[PDB]
Design a protein around this ligand. Structure first.
Ligand SMILES: CCCCCCCC(=O)OC[C@H](COP(=O)(O)O[C@@H]1[C@H](O)[C@@H](OP(=O)(O)O)[C@H](OP(=O)(O)O)[C@@H](OP(=O)(O)O)[C@H]1O)OC(=O)CCCCCCC
Ligand SMILES: *[C@@H]1O[C@H](CO)[C@@H](O[C@@H]2O[C@H](CO)[C@@H](O[C@@H]3O[C@H](CO)[C@@H](O)[C@H](O)[C@@H]3O)[C@H](O)[C@H]2NC(C)=O)[C@H](O)[C@H]1NC(C)=O
Ligand SMILES: *[C@@H]1O[C@H](CO)[C@@H](O)[C@H](O)[C@H]1NC(C)=O
Ligand SMILES: *[C@@H]1O[C@H](CO)[C@@H](O)[C@H](O)[C@H]1NC(C)=O
Ligand SMILES: [Mg+2]
Lengths: 328, 1112
């Protein structure tokens, strides 16, 4: 027919190849180095996570005898809830203040898509023409909602304050920092204010506030760098959670200049303006104070999982070794 | 009643006047034929409905357009490859009349009724009518080795009127002849017609019609008038109907695509039910989940059912078909490239001319082979002979045995001898030269006279035109041994006896016929004595020997030795005729010749009168040379558990000889014929009016003629129901034969039509549900090549009839070793490895949405980025599995020929069942549980919580997609056994490509251009910088793969496969003895156990020399 095929390794189907064989001496080592490397990691994660100082206060007050059930039915919409908690052990270094919501499906598909990123990106066209996705919250009466969406509308609007109850019994306020709680990319890339002008008043012209919001997006904060679409608390909320039970960074309690602990052990009071209702759908609001760890945060599951997987790998290796020896 | 000597074409008006004679349909083809392509078009519609859409239309078009584009690209090269196949090999040209003179024309520029012209060794382009020819009386000799298996030449005659008026070219052009004949039929043994010319009617018969598969032999030129052309030729009518061949796994994959569809509907319906329930006691109380749409909870569940069809759509693959056919396309090129299947003698490589039937080569159960031209070279050589009880042919020197290593005999002392005779025996030469044993001289004088061959001396080269290759072998052999047939005349022959020019007067040639099994010649010596010389079968000749035959016992022993060596044997004899005895017989002989009323039987009666007391000269032995490696190939494919059946159109004697030479029939086998087979089948009928037909331990073979094949298979209102018994009675008989024939070690069907060949193949496909391979050459094998699951066409010859209709095409039968044991065996392993992993990586990827449903309110929120689902099946997991399906090798090609037992794995369909399919779905299901619930455990707690905390859905999505890509690309490395550089590059390149593209999508630069499409800006940078995110990804991959490694090791340690055992002792294997024929099986106790007689020849040649028809 045609000429002779050319003698190449690929076409003659003899490419230089490594032939791995799952021999007794090739798989058993990987079942022991994994076992001997995963166990120490699990010990490190487990012990380090346990060393993290954390307190979690559930201020939802859904069950009676919690001293702010009065805020489940706030006849006067200013409702203030006060809870006394004690830090048996002092907190050292930077401490992070979080608020947690349980049974809050912020990953619902109808919810996740209810936003206009082109609007949050500071696009002039998308400011006055919110997308169809944020449909129920596009326009309030005649002009469009500036942060359109079910996500922006349902923003966490509780206010949390911490006071240190000293020996004098006078509550000492604790400084809370609301800056640098969001992703740098979210602050400086994803979220931008509408272009032009120098005052947010004129920039957000011809747009309503979200129906659930008390005040417009103009004055989310007094700082010109923390109001508008670039507000830290707003951007933290906009970052939807992966699971129904989550927590979102609220404030940074910076390390004190003095050598004393940032949150010395003693009596504390949590003064929260109850604004966010979650008890309708069996939700739970929480306040979490946690100290910084150079191994991320407190993840005992990863510590235990590495011990379990590492332990089983060693156990499998011994079982495989016995089986191989019998069938040698 | 059934006749063992004929091909039963019976059990299976036209008018001729002389000289008066690309992308739109392919996309649609792959859409409708494939249910999955319409499935992905339906999803596009469901993805464009905002009420139900859960994934962007990008998520399906991008994979679909790539899949559609790649399929179109493959279909183009197949279209171009097929065009090249047809064009480059259909370059056949014949001379036709369309102007005042002949001119070269293609075989396609042939109309019904145009005068043509052929030369020596020309294939006949169409069924023609002999009008004139070079040799006298407008004869024409044609070999029909392509129309049937017959290896001898047949003479054809023209009309006595066309012979004497259409000799010149000028009159052929003006020939205005009108022919009425039957409509195109398949039956090649007669032709009913009439030629109306010169105001006269001339009836026609098949002796005047040259058929398409014929080849002109020993004729300088012959002119014919085309009667039929193209598909109207009787040989094309015998070609079957082309069918669209599909593999055993092609049907399987359709069932599996329907199984994943059913699973997808059921999972979506359950998840839709859960959402309807979730929206009742949770979703309706959630103020933040208010969409201003008065949708009832059950309507939301109905409305999300289409959402989960979209989300879980990747369960059914979008690249399964392209991946399967891209793998087969590459696997088909390894056949075209194999240098071990390349025949350098004819410059013919193997050709995978169908790129769609590849893994089926690794599943063959039965091989149905042709004989003439497929198992043989169409060469016959004189090997041995017994003279006066002394066997000649062994390696000998001088007058006594000295050593085995003997040089070729020197024939320089002979003037006419040439090198065609490779004889290693010098003792015979002294007997011829010395002359002390004149019967040795007399033995080879017989071979130079008892033939009926013709001699060509037009230029002094003394070429022999033998119609029987046996005669050509014997006449050539005697020519080398000093007895050369020089010239022939109507009455005389001019044999030269060692240079002595002696002219004998032929008084009678007792022609050959199949039932006669011998021929004789009576010649008058120059002295004046009359001698009768006869050669033929040992059985017939031993019935006509003189009482005093001292060499009878010794000659019988030699015939047994020749028979045990798989050679074709003839017995030589003669007698002295007295002058008074001959004239008495001659008077009766002449009467039977002139008497035309019963000439055939009249001549036979007088033949027996003179062949009464014959003195035995000796015996000959002729080898019908097989193709090299044929017995080796049959022994190895028998170790692969493949049964080889020989279906040939050649005579029973030739078929049985090649069966013994091929080692298919040994001296252990007991051979059953149609007479015996029919009796056994009958006994099964009255017995039932299943017990094994034979004892299990015996060795048996069937030699079945076409007449007996029809006899045993019954293929020789009241009408309505009466047919059901006739059809049901046949169907029971059809099944009984298949069970009988499949109970035999070997089966040979001889004298069968092209339809019968396909019929036998079809019976095994039906009643055994077996995968069948048919290999052959010539147009009589096209029917079974098209019928079989795989059809191989022996290429490299000059006629390409079986090549065009075949799936594969190599030149040598021995290349069937590598086609099945190497290429098919690997192709099956590689196809099943691909399917085992391909359905793993699609379930592991898609079932993550299923587990995330239990934490997002059953809202069909994807667990991945929108653009990860777009590129997963085309970028992140496409290349590595393709490279495995093209490069995997469990053992070496040389080590897979050494162990044909590895082939049985694919015959039993062990590497991919419905069970192996569901085990890979369970593998993907369990992988998706870990790919989700390990990240979920980490994310349920603190995962790097600071300002840049990746505890959100996007970080969750990136983490699971990262672990999935590493896991499914590390699984394909555990599956791979042949780790090439490209295999390593694809596995790590696929993981590297995912990270490279992901960081490009999650970038500030692209977000500014269009924020709407890309929502994951900055997620990869934040998520993959955290130690817990990488500690979570590492843990997920380890838990996904460590159990797999333990299972693979335990399975290999406790239940190692045949490949595993060979690899363990690969370096400790050194004993591989080459195949050897059974050199000696001689025994004592029976004078005759089997007759090795075989002689391909026909009637009518003696009558040509007897008259002046063939003498010029
Ligand atoms: C650790 C306990 C195993 C739990 C699974 C229970 C075991 C199970 O159902 O099957 C395991 C599945 C299937 O995935 P696999 O393909 O890895 O399992 C097959 C494996 O390929 C064997 O080796 P091999 O022939 O492929 O070289 C095969 O041997 P053989 O062909 O001779 O029979 C056998 O077939 P068989 O089962 O006999 O039909 C299966 O065990 O996935 C896994 O390999 C691990 C999945 C789990 C991974 C995540 C961990 C939960
Ligand atoms: C903090 O956020 C909650 C919701 O996350 C706010 O409660 C919501 O307040 C809006 C009004 O601003 C209510 O919308 C509509 O108000 C009209 C009065 O014009 C009322 O008649 C309707 O019932 C309608 O809902 C919305 O229902 C209400 N939602 C809930 C769950 O209470 C709250 O006002 C916010 N507080 C601050 C200080 O930002
Ligand atoms: C919490 O502290 C406040 C002020 O210190 C006090 O009035 C209130 O009774 C305390 N409640 C409980 C439950 O200790
Ligand atoms: C709690 O905070 C509110 C608002 O900042 C303030 O008016 C009140 O005095 C604080 N202390 C309480 C409620 O005990
Ligand atoms: Mg043939």
């Amino acid at each position: 027919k045609t000429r002779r095929p050319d003698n190449t390794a690929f076409k003659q189907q003899r490419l230089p190849a490594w032939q791995p064989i799952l021999t007794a001496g090739t798989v058993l080592p990987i079942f022991f180095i994994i076992g001997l490397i995963f166990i120490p990691i699990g010990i490190g994660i487990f012990v380090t996570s346990n060393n993290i100082r954390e307190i979690e206060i559930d201020y939802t007050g859904t069950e009676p005898s919690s001293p702010c059930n009065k805020c489940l039915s706030p006849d006067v919409t200013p409702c203030f809830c006060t809870i006394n908690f004690t830090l048996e052990k002092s907190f050292e270094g930077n401490v992070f203040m979080y608020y947690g919501l349980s049974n809050f499906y912020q990953n619902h598909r109808r919810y996740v898509k209810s936003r206009d990123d082109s609007q949050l990106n500071g696009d002039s066209s998308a400011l006055l023409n919110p997308s169809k996705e944020c449909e129920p919250y596009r326009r309030n009466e005649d002009k469009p909602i500036a942060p359109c969406g079910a996500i922006a509308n349902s923003m966490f609007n509780d206010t949390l304050e911490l006071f240190l109850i000293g020996n004098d019994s006078y509550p000492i306020p604790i400084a809370l920092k609301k800056k640098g709680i969001a992703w740098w990319t979210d602050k400086n890339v994803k979220f931008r204010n509408p272009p032009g002008g120098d005052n947010l008043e004129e920039r957000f012209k011809g747009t309503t506030k979200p129906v659930n919001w008390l005040k417009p997006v103009y004055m989310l904060d007094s700082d010109p760098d923390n109001n508008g679409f670039i507000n830290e608390d707003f951007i933290v909320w906009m970052r939807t959670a992966a699971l129904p039970t989550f927590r979102k960074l609220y404030r940074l309690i910076e390390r004190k200049s003095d050598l004393h602990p940032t949150l010395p052990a003693g009596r504390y009071s949590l003064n929260v303006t109850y604004n966010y209702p979650v008890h309708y759908f069996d939700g739970r609001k929480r306040m979490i104070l946690s100290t910084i760890s150079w191994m991320g945060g407190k993840n005992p599951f990863l510590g235990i999982a590495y011990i379990a997987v590492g332990s089983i790998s060693f156990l499998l290796g011994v079982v495989l070794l016995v089986i191989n020896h019998k069938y040698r | 009643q059934p006749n063992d000597e004929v091909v039963p074409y019976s059990d299976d008006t036209w008018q001729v006047k002389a000289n008066d004679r690309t992308f739109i349909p392919m996309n649609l083809f792959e859409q409708f034929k494939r249910a999955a392509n319409l499935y992905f078009l339906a999803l596009l519609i469901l993805q464009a409905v905002p009420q139900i859409s859960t994934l962007a239309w990008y998520t399906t078009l991008v994979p679909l357009l790539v899949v559609l584009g790649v399929t179109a690209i493959k279909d183009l090269v197949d279209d171009v490859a097929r065009h090249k196949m047809d064009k480059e090999i259909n370059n056949r040209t014949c001379e036709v009349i369309k102007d005042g003179r002949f001119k070269v024309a293609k075989w396609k520029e042939i109309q019904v009724g145009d005068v043509i012209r052929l030369k020596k060794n020309d294939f006949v382009p169409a069924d023609i009518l002999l009008l004139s020819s070079s040799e006298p009386n407008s004869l024409c000799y044609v070999e029909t080795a392509e129309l049937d298996g017959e290896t001898n030449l047949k003479f054809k005659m023209s009309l006595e009127i066309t012979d004497q008026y259409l000799q010149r070219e000028d009159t052929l052009a003006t020939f205005d002849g009108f022919i009425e004949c039957e409509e195109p039929n398949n039956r090649l043994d007669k032709f009913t017609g009439t030629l109306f010319w010169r105001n006269t009617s001339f009836p026609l018969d098949a002796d005047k019609i040259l058929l398409r598969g014929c080849v002109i032999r020993n004729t300088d030129f012959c002119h014919g008038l085309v009667i039929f052309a193209g598909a109207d030729t009787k040989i094309m009518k015998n070609s079957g109907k082309t069918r669209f061949k599909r593999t055993k796994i092609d049907y399987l994959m359709n069932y599996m695509v329907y199984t994943i569809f059913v699973v997808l509907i059921l999972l979506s319906a359950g998840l839709a039910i859960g959402h309807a329930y979730w929206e009742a006691q949770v979703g309706n109380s959630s103020w933040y989940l208010y969409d201003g749409e008065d949708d009832t909870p059950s309507y939301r569940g109905f409305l999300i059912f289409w959402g989960y069809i979209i989300v879980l759509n990747t369960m059914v693959p979008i690249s399964l078909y392209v991946s399967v056919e891209v793998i087969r396309l590459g696997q088909s090129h390894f056949i075209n490239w194999d240098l071990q299947m390349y025949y350098a003698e004819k410059d013919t490589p193997a050709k995978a001319r169908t790129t769609t039937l590849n893994e089926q080569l690794g599943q063959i159960h039965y091989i149905f082979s042709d004989k003439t031209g497929t198992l043989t070279q169409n060469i016959m050589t004189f090997k041995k002979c017994c003279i006066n009880g002394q066997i000649y042919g062994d390696h000998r020197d001088a007058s006594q045995h000295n050593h085995n290593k003997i040089e070729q005999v020197d024939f320089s002392w002979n003037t006419y001898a040439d090198g065609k005779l490779a004889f290693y025996d010098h003792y015979l030469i002294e007997q011829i030269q010395s002359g002390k044993e004149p019967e040795v001289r007399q033995f080879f004088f017989l071979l130079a006279v008892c033939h009926t061959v013709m001699v060509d001396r037009t230029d002094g080269q003394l070429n022999y035109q033998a119609a029987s290759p046996d005669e050509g072998a014997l006449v050539n052999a005697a020519r080398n041994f000093g007895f050369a047939f020089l010239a022939r005349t109507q009455n005389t022959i001019t044999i030269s006896e060692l240079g002595t020019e002696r002219t004998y007067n032929v008084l009678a040639i007792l022609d050959f016929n199949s039932d006669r099994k011998r021929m004789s010649i009576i010649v008058r010596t120059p002295e004046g004595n009359i001698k009768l010389y006869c050669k033929g079968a040992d059985t017939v000749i031993y019935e006509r020997l003189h009482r005093m035959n001292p060499t009878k016992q010794e000659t019988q022993d030699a015939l047994d030795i020749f028979a045990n060596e798989t050679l074709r044997t003839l017995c030589l004899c003669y007698k002295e005729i007295e002058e008074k005895e001959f004239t008495e017989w001659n008077k009766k002989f002449m009467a039977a010749s002139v008497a035309s009323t019963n000439r055939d039987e009249a001549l036979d009666k007088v033949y027996e009168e003179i062949e009464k007391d014959l003195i035995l000269l000796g015996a000959t032995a002729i080898e019908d040379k097989l193709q090299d490696g044929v017995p080796e190939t049959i022994s190895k494919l028998a170790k692969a558990d493949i049964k080889i059946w020989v279906l040939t159109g050649d005579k029973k004697e030739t078929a049985e000889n090649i069966g013994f030479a091929c080692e298919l029939l040994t001296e252990d086998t007991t051979i059953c014929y149609g007479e015996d087979i029919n009796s056994l089948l009958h006994a099964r009928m009255e017995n039932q009016r299943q017990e094994s037909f034979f004892p299990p331990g015996g060795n048996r073979a069937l030699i079945i003629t076409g007449s007996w094949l029809n006899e045993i298979l019954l293929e020789k209102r009241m009408r309505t129901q009466s047919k059901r018994r006739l059809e049901a009675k046949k169907e029971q008989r059809q099944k009984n034969f298949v069970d009988l024939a499949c109970e035999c070690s070997a089966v040979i069907c001889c004298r069968v039509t092209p339809k019968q060949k396909a019929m036998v193949v079809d019976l095994v496909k039906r009643y055994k549900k077996a995968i069948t391979l048919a290999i052959g050459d010539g147009a009589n094998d096209v029917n079974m090549i098209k019928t079989a699951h795989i059809g191989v066409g022996i290429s490299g010859q000059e006629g390409m009839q079986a090549v065009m209709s075949s799936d594969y095409s190599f030149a040598q039968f021995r290349y069937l070793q590598r086609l099945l044991l190497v290429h098919g065996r690997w192709s099956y392993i590689r196809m099943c490895k691909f399917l085992r992993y391909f359905f793993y990586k699609n379930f592991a990827f898609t079932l993550v949405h299923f587990w995330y449903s239990f934490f997002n309110g059953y809202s069909a929120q994807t667990a991945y980025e929108d653009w990860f689902i777009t590129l997963y099946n085309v970028l992140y997991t496409s290349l590595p599995v393709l490279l495995m399906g093209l490069l995997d090798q469990d053992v070496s090609d040389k080590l897979s020929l050494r162990f044909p037992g590895l082939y049985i794995v694919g015959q039993r369909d062990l590497l991919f069942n419905y069970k192996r399919f569901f085990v890979s779905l369970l593998h993907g299901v369990l992988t998706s549980m870990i790919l989700f619930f390990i990240p979920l455990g980490a994310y349920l707690q603190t995962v790097g919580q600071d300002g840049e905390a990746p505890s959100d859905y996007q970080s969750f999505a990136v983490t699971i997609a990262s672990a999935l890509v590493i896991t499914v690309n590390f699984q394909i490395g555990l599956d791979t056994s042949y780790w090439t550089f490209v295999n390593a590059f694809s596995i790590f390149g696929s993981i590297a490509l995912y990270f490279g593209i992901m960081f490009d999508f999650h970038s500030a630069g692209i977000h500014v251009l269009f924020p709407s499409a890309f929502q994951f800006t900055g997620t990869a940078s934040n998520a993959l910088r955290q130690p817990y995110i990488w500690l979570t990804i590492i843990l997920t991959v380890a838990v996904c793969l460590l159990p797999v490694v333990a299972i693979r090791f335990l399975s290999m340690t406790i239940w190692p496969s045949e490949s595993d055992k060979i690899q363990k002792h690969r370096k400790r294997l050194k004993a591989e003895e080459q195949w050897q024929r059974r050199q000696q099986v001689f025994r004592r106790g029976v004078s005759t156990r089997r007759s090795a007689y075989a002689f391909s020849h026909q009637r009518g040649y003696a009558d040509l020399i007897s008259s002046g028809r063939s003498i010029r």
